[PDB]
Amino acid sequence: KITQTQPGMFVQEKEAVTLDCTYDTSDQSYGLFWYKQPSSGEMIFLIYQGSYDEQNATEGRYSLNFQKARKSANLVISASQLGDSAMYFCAMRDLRDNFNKFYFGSGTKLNVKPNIQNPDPAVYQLRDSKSSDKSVCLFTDFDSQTNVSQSKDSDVYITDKCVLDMRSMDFKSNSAVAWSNKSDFACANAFNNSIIPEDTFFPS
Amino acid sequence: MIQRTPKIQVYSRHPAENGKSNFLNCYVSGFHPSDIEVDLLKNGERIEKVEHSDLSFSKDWSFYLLYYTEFTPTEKDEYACRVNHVTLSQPKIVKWDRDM
Amino acid sequence: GSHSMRYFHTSVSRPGRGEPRFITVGYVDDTLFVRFDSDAASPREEPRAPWIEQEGPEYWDRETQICKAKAQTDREDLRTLLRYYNQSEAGSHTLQNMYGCDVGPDGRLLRGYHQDAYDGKDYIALNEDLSSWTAADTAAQITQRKWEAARVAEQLRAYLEGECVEWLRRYLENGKETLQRADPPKTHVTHHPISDHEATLRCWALGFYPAEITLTWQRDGEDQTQDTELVETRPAGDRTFQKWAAVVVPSGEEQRYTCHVQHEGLPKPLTLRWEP
Amino acid sequence: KRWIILGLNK
Amino acid sequence: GVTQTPKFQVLKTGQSMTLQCAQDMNHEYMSWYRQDPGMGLRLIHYSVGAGITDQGEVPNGYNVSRSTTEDFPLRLLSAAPSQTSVYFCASREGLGGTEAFFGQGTRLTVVEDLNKVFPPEVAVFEPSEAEISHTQKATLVCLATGFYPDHVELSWWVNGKEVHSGVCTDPQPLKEQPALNDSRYALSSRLRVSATFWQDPRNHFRCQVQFYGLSENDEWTQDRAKPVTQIVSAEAWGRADASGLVPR
């Protein structure tokens, strides 16, 4: 039995984050495992701790704060990177079945928030590069403390906020995209559902 | 493949006394590999109810086993241990001798 | 005095006749106390000495699991070792493992052990260090790297230093009346005439425990070692052991020969003669 | 009392 | 280490399929899990060695074989909607091993009727002049729409090379009709470059969506093009100025 109480954790990039795990086992012999599952769905093994290992495991930026007495096996991720945003599974195998099954926790979605140096909230309209009159709305450059609510209207599509990172300039920015088949749909209303900065730039 | 031919001793648990219930032992040791065939014989016939110990081994890795069976010895009855092993061309028979 | 706990493990592959036979046994000193045989109808770690029987069901379930786990580890290791040695899946092979600890009369670790053998030959061994590995060959070196990487010695060393010692102590206490009772050998000398010129003098030691014992023949009280036939100490089948020592001596000279017996259960060493 | 850890494969 | 295939699979109810799994690690132990919401990772079958397989927690509907230690193919004789899941092949040195390596995963969708399978349409939306003017940055947006099932991989290509810097793609596709498990999906992605990089008609921006759909063998009973695994792209070129003239 693996308990990850946190369905999600957020952390400021570069900061360290601790993902909670507790495990229930009667056996004196077991191993605790962490796996990372990024958006693309793979299961990346990160780190392992044996119940008889007196040292706490370490693997790159991952450390496992193994407290046998408290029955916790928290993963600590040092210097969080945007690439760390993912699902994290705490898992365990024990003697009862000769270490056969992995018992995985529900998992914790780590959300690494970018440090936004100079917010410049704005909603731009983009046009299809093809001989179409199709259009897209781009809410961009807002800080990590504004949130994008999806539409409450079913004919307008709005993506969750996405952080892109222009590495050469060490520049990061959030965006959310919105588009509609509808006709009254203008960008000036596209994100009405979200509470957007009062100074959010809406070009003419 | 290391091969070590089994040492064999045949003897009674307790000092042999005709008419007195006792235990006939066949100790096979120093052998390798472990697969081995051991029978206790009464007058050259196989004794049906023979137990043996759990396979174990000595510091040099060579194996030992105790085969044994309840028996009442007599002046006339002859007992022996027949051991076959891969290191043995022919099954090896060691006769029980009260004086060893 | 000094005491030991040892676990012995043997896995024998039998290709074309099922899966590997696994047998493991537990000794305190010279006393078998636990066993597991993968061939038993419903395999459990079973007690084999009374004092261990107090241990509760959690103990027996756990020991059973560990043995099962060892059995399985072994099956995998036999497969692996075929690849290490480029051997055929057709041949039958043996994995052997022994481990355990020696404690001094003080009850502290004297020496710990962990050793594996493949086909009757040393494979890999924990050094006296309890901290480093000695690989017998190139295959075993592979194993060494795997085990160094996993920091196995560290954890094995803690086991040999903690649980092993501590449970050995507790076994010794629970089996005080037997494990810590030394049973002296009943001794006697037999005379066996070869011919008119010679006789065999055979000095017997029976019903003793522990197995450790010294039997020596002297002639006019002087060393008769490289002239003595010692049979391997043998189990009587009731947890005590037997041994005899033999000299071939000139007929009529028997009275110059004394048998000497040293054993934990003897307050003082024995001197025996044949009753001429 | 037996010893055991994960990852002891040869 | 563990090469599990395919990464994506849509299956018509009743069809067979073999999920493939090979490991180049001389691992004795192989297993299959399926990952399902609220169900954690469930073991399906496992193999402690070549020639040995056993049933996990949910073996039913699956069979496995272990002809060699290297491969542990998972077989779905008769696809069922229930078997819609994410499958992971796992391997390790032994039953008691700690080198527990999972495969890339196989995302399996069992459909009642393949007529629900639709490839994406892909569009690229050029950077707003307003953004360019306001930020000196230029955000392109790629929109993959109308697809089913969720089995796409979206990539940006600049001047013929996959690019990652400045790219952000929705983590999970968004349903065009979310309450229907049959509905089609849309996915967006942004690629941000400097205005001055964008203001070069010689710079080529292609959004590429690899879609996993029907195979050649799948029966296709519609008039519309069979929605097979395919790549769908849309592109755009830099907008040079009025005005000349690529900026320095």
Protein described:
The complex is a heteropentamer of chains A (204), B (100), C (276), D (10) and E (248). In chain B, 0% of the residues lie in helices and 47% in strands. Chain B is mainly β. Chain B has one domain (1-100): Immunoglobulin-like. Chain B is elongated, with a radius of gyration of 14 Å. In chain B, 38% of the residues are buried. Chain C has 276 residues and is α+β, with helices and mostly antiparallel strands. Chain C has two domains: 1-181, MHC class I-like antigen recognition-like (Murine Class I Major Histocompatibility Complex, H2-DB, Chain A, domain 1); 182-276, Immunoglobulin-like (Sandwich). Chain D is low in regular secondary structure and 10 residues long. Helix content of chain D is 0%, strand content 0%. Chain D has no helix or strand. Chain D is elongated. The termini of chain D are far apart. With 248 residues, chain E is mostly beta strands. Chain E has two domains: 1-112, Sandwich (Immunoglobulin-like), CATH 2.60.40; 113-238, Immunoglobulin-like (Sandwich). Chain E has helices at 129-135, 195-198, and strands spanning 2-5, 8-12, 17-23, 29-36, 40-49, 52-55, 63-64, 74-76, 85-92, 101-102, 106-111, 121-126, 137-147, 152-158, 161-163, 167-169, 174-175, 185-194, 204-211, 230-237. Chains A and E meet through strand 5, strand 6, strand 11, strand 13 and strand 14 of A and strand 5, strand 9, strand 10, strand 12 and helix 1 of E. Chain B: This is Beta-2-microglobulin. Chain B: Disulfide bonds join 26-81.
What are the defining features of this structure?
heteropentamer; A: 204 residues; mainly beta; Immunoglobulin-like; 2 domains; 6-stranded mixed beta sheet; 5-stranded antiparallel beta sheet; 17 strands; B: 100 residues; immune system; TCR; KK10; HIV
How many structural domains can be distinguished in the coordinates of chain A? 2
Q: Can you write the helix and strand succession of chain E as a string?
A: EEEEEEEEEEEEHEEEEEEHEE
Q: Separation of termini of chain A?
A: 57 Å
Compute the number of helices of chain A: 1
Question: How would a textbook summarize the main sheet of chain A?
Answer: 6 strands, mixed
- What portion of residues of chain E belong to β-strands? over 45%
Main pleated-sheet profile of chain E:
7 strands, mixed
Number of DSSP strand runs of chain A: 17
CATH level-4 homologous superfamily of the largest domain in chain A: Immunoglobulins
CATH class of the largest domain in chain A: Mainly Beta
Number of helices of chain E: 2
Strand content of chain A: 35-45%
Strand count of chain E: 20
Q: What is the C-alpha radius of gyration of chain A, as a whole number of Å?
A: 22 Å
Q: Helix-strand pattern of chain A, N to C?
A: EEEEEEEEEEEEEEEEEH
Overall structural domain count of chain E? 2
What is the annotated CATH architecture of the largest domain in chain A?
A: Sandwich
Portion of residues within helices of chain A: under 10%
How much is the radius of gyration of chain E in Å?
Answer: 22 Å
CATH topology assignment of the largest domain in chain E:
Immunoglobulin-like
**Which class best fits the helix and strand makeup of chain A?**
mainly beta
